[PDB]
Design an enzyme around this catalytic site. Structure first.
Site, PDB file in Angstrom:
ATOM      1  N   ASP A 126       0.821  -1.217   0.000  1.00  0.00           N
ATOM      2  CA  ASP A 126       0.000   0.000   0.000  1.00  0.00           C
ATOM      3  C   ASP A 126       0.853   1.265   0.000  1.00  0.00           C
ATOM      4  O   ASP A 126       0.376   2.394   0.097  1.00  0.00           O
ATOM      5  CB  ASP A 126      -0.965  -0.025   1.190  1.00  0.00           C
ATOM      6  CG  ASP A 126      -0.360   0.059   2.567  1.00  0.00           C
ATOM      7  OD1 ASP A 126       0.874   0.055   2.744  1.00  0.00           O
ATOM      8  OD2 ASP A 126      -1.128   0.137   3.555  1.00  0.00           O
TER       9      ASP A 126
ATOM     10  N   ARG B 135       1.077   6.849   0.023  1.00  0.00           N
ATOM     11  CA  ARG B 135       0.185   5.865   0.599  1.00  0.00           C
ATOM     12  C   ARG B 135      -1.009   5.732  -0.336  1.00  0.00           C
ATOM     13  O   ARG B 135      -1.648   6.733  -0.672  1.00  0.00           O
ATOM     14  CB  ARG B 135      -0.268   6.296   1.993  1.00  0.00           C
ATOM     15  CG  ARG B 135      -1.334   5.405   2.617  1.00  0.00           C
ATOM     16  CD  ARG B 135      -0.738   4.058   2.979  1.00  0.00           C
ATOM     17  NE  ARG B 135      -1.569   3.256   3.862  1.00  0.00           N
ATOM     18  CZ  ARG B 135      -2.677   2.622   3.498  1.00  0.00           C
ATOM     19  NH1 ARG B 135      -3.158   2.663   2.260  1.00  0.00           N
ATOM     20  NH2 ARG B 135      -3.353   1.914   4.397  1.00  0.00           N
TER      21      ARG B 135
ATOM     22  N   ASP C 278      -6.522  -1.143   2.276  1.00  0.00           N
ATOM     23  CA  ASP C 278      -5.623  -1.706   3.260  1.00  0.00           C
ATOM     24  C   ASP C 278      -5.125  -3.059   2.768  1.00  0.00           C
ATOM     25  O   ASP C 278      -5.985  -3.947   2.688  1.00  0.00           O
ATOM     26  CB  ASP C 278      -6.322  -1.898   4.607  1.00  0.00           C
ATOM     27  CG  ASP C 278      -5.923  -0.841   5.619  1.00  0.00           C
ATOM     28  OD1 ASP C 278      -5.129  -1.161   6.528  1.00  0.00           O
ATOM     29  OD2 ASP C 278      -6.398   0.309   5.510  1.00  0.00           O
ATOM     30  N   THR C 279      -3.844  -3.190   2.500  1.00  0.00           N
ATOM     31  CA  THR C 279      -3.253  -4.469   2.137  1.00  0.00           C
ATOM     32  C   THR C 279      -2.655  -5.165   3.362  1.00  0.00           C
ATOM     33  O   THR C 279      -2.305  -4.505   4.334  1.00  0.00           O
ATOM     34  CB  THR C 279      -2.098  -4.391   1.124  1.00  0.00           C
ATOM     35  OG1 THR C 279      -1.094  -3.543   1.700  1.00  0.00           O
ATOM     36  CG2 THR C 279      -2.512  -3.774  -0.193  1.00  0.00           C
TER      37      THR C 279
ATOM     38  N   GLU D 141       0.163  -6.565   5.621  1.00  0.00           N
ATOM     39  CA  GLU D 141       1.443  -5.859   5.664  1.00  0.00           C
ATOM     40  C   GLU D 141       2.624  -6.817   5.702  1.00  0.00           C
ATOM     41  O   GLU D 141       2.501  -7.924   6.221  1.00  0.00           O
ATOM     42  CB  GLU D 141       1.475  -4.928   6.879  1.00  0.00           C
ATOM     43  CG  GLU D 141       1.619  -3.463   6.493  1.00  0.00           C
ATOM     44  CD  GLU D 141       0.947  -2.530   7.480  1.00  0.00           C
ATOM     45  OE1 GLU D 141       1.400  -2.470   8.643  1.00  0.00           O
ATOM     46  OE2 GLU D 141      -0.030  -1.860   7.084  1.00  0.00           O
TER      47      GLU D 141
ATOM     48  N   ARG E  44       3.230  11.342   4.195  1.00  0.00           N
ATOM     49  CA  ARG E  44       2.983  10.601   2.949  1.00  0.00           C
ATOM     50  C   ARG E  44       1.886  11.228   2.099  1.00  0.00           C
ATOM     51  O   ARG E  44       0.818  11.648   2.545  1.00  0.00           O
ATOM     52  CB  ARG E  44       2.617   9.150   3.252  1.00  0.00           C
ATOM     53  CG  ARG E  44       3.633   8.445   4.122  1.00  0.00           C
ATOM     54  CD  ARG E  44       3.199   7.015   4.393  1.00  0.00           C
ATOM     55  NE  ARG E  44       2.077   6.968   5.331  1.00  0.00           N
ATOM     56  CZ  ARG E  44       1.486   5.844   5.716  1.00  0.00           C
ATOM     57  NH1 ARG E  44       1.883   4.655   5.270  1.00  0.00           N
ATOM     58  NH2 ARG E  44       0.477   5.939   6.565  1.00  0.00           N
TER      59      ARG E  44
END
Length: 136
Positions: free
Chosen positions: A16, A30, A35-36, A38, A82
């Site tokens: 992500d 970002r 949401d991937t 992690e 980010r």
């Protein structure tokens, strides 16, 4: 009306998060609304499908002819500095691609940065229906 701007891949950091050259400056981006799993998760560590999500984002951007960033209508950076954006690889949105493949969930959405939320939610329902990856 959102606008796409060109950018250059510097380094993929995780599923992500990617480092890009944007208007002459190296910046961490970002991916908005996803949401991937992690690989660099602060608390757990290496999560299931993390390596996969992460290789997907990398290959997708590394193999593109053209990378573009699209800011939403709210804040364009988060508290970590980010950049917050939709990222396009040859016209295709990486954020949607990950969700469509079941390698990302749609995140908790903060208006006003939620312009593609409905599209992504529809891509996520299909991956669920297809029981892909995260959803299998």
């Amino acid at each position: 009306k959102l606008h796409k701007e060109p950018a250059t891949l510097i380094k993929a950091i995780d599923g992500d998060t990617v480092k890009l050259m944007y208007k002459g400056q190296p910046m961490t981006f970002r991916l908005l609304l996803v949401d991937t799993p992690e690989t660099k998760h602060p608390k757990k560590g290496v999560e299931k499908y993390g390596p996969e999500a992460s290789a997907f984002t990398k290959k997708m951007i590394e193999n593109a002819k053209k990378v573009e960033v699209e800011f939403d209508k709210g804040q364009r950076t988060d508290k970590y500095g980010r950049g917050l954006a939709y990222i396009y690889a040859d016209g295709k949105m990486v954020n949607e691609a990950l969700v469509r493949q079941g390698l990302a969930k749609v995140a908790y959405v903060y208006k006003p940065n939620n312009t593609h939320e409905q599209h992504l939610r529809k891509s996520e329902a299909q991956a669920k229906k297809e029981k892909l990856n995260i959803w299998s």
